[PDB]
């Protein structure tokens, strides 16, 4: 279920994200590369990337746009961490494009983990981060299952 963060937890999440927020596209490019490299089945889900070597596409506009759009959503979730409705709406809106798609919970959860590992959080910040991401996935998976109206 959705579990709100305290004011102090919100501050923890903002602080946890601040290095990435400060280098959003550069972090996005690195994290997205590492994700595709570690979990190579996923590149095929991106039709603009499909059929080419990862090292050939990593420097391209198409690739950087995708990595950017993922990170922009998380950046906006963070921005909305103190507003449950606003946070839910960010996710609600990005969920539609995903509903019809052959992407497993495993694939999304593998991306969450690459992000986690890149942030190297202490346990206090990590706990607050994981409250937010647990909310993220709760909302996202509810919308993938066609129960996205409940957040409206
Ligand atoms: C969980 C965090 C994610 C976020 C915040 C996110 C965000 C977005 C956004 C903003 C779009 C743009 C809407 C569009 O033009 O379709 C999009 C599209 C899309 N995403 Fe995601 N995404 C996430 C995870 C994933 C994963 C893990 C995959 C594949 C394994 C994936 C595959 C796709 C595909 C295939 C599209 C449709 C557009 C296209 O053909 O590239 N997404 N996503
Ligand atoms: Cl894989
Ligand atoms: Cl490859
Ligand atoms: Cl994406
Ligand atoms: Cl607010
Ligand atoms: Cl930390």
Q: Rg of the Cα trace of the chain? A: 15
- Experimental method, per PDB record: X-ray
The verdict on whether residue 125 carries a ligand-binding annotation is: no
Contacts of 139 (CB under 8 A, 6+ apart): 2, 87, 88, 91, 92, 95, 148, 151
Q: How far apart are CA 111 and CA 36, in angstroms?
A: 9
Q: Are 64 and 25 in contact (CB under 8 A)?
A: yes
Q: How many Cβ atoms from other residues are within 10 Å of residue 136's Cβ?
A: 21
| Residue 125 host element (H or E) | helix 123-144
Q: How far apart are CA 5 and CA 14, in angstroms?
A: 12
CATH superfamily of domain region 6-152: Globins (1.10.490.10)
Kindly list the domain boundaries of the chain, sorted by start residue.
Answer: 6-152
- Residue 59, exposed/middle/buried by CB under 10 A (0-12, 13-18, 19+)? exposed
Q: 3-state class of 4 per DSSP?
A: coil
Burial letters 79-91, b for 16+ CB under 10 A, else e: ebbbebeebbbbb
- The distance in angstroms from the start CA to the end CA of the chain is 16
Q: How far apart are CA 118 and CA 113, in angstroms?
A: 8
CA-to-CA dists, residue 61 to 56, 68, 106, 131, angstroms: 12, 10, 27, 33
The verdict on whether residue 101 carries a ligand-binding annotation is: yes
- DSSP secondary structure letter of residue 61: H
The verdict on whether residue 14 carries a ligand-binding annotation is: no
Q: 3-state class of 144 per DSSP?
A: helix
With a Cβ cut-off of 6 Å, ligand 1 is lined by: 42, 45-47, 66, 69-70, 73-74, 94, 97-98, 101, 103, 107-108, 111
Positive or negative torsion for Cα 31, 39, 124, 77: positive
CA-to-CA dists, residue 128 to 45, 65, 85, 94, angstroms: 31, 28, 18, 23
Q: Which of 32, 34, 97, 108 to mutate to test the pocket of ligand 1 (most atoms within 8 A of CB)?
A: 97
Contacts of 73 (CB under 8 A, 6+ apart): 90, 91, 94
């Amino acid at each position: 279920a959705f579990v709100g963060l305290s004011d102090s937890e919100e501050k923890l999440v903002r602080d946890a994200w601040a290095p990435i927020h400060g280098d959003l596209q550069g972090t996005a490019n690195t994290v997205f590369y590492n994700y595709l490299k570690k979990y190579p089945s996923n590149q095929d889900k991106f039709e603009t990337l499909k059929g080419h070597p990862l090292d050939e596409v990593k420097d391209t506009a198409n690739f950087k746009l995708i990595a950017g759009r993922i990170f922009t959503i998380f950046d906006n979730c963070v921005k909305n961490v103190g507003n449950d409705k606003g946070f839910q709406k960010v996710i609600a809106d990005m969920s539609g494009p995903h509903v019809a798609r052959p992407i497993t919970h495993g694939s999304y959860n593998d991306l969450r983990g690459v992000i986690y590992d890149s942030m190297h959080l202490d346990s206090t910040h990590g706990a607050a981060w994981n409250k937010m991401m647990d909310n993220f996935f709760y909302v996202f998976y509810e919308c993938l299952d066609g129960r996205c109206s409940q957040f409206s």
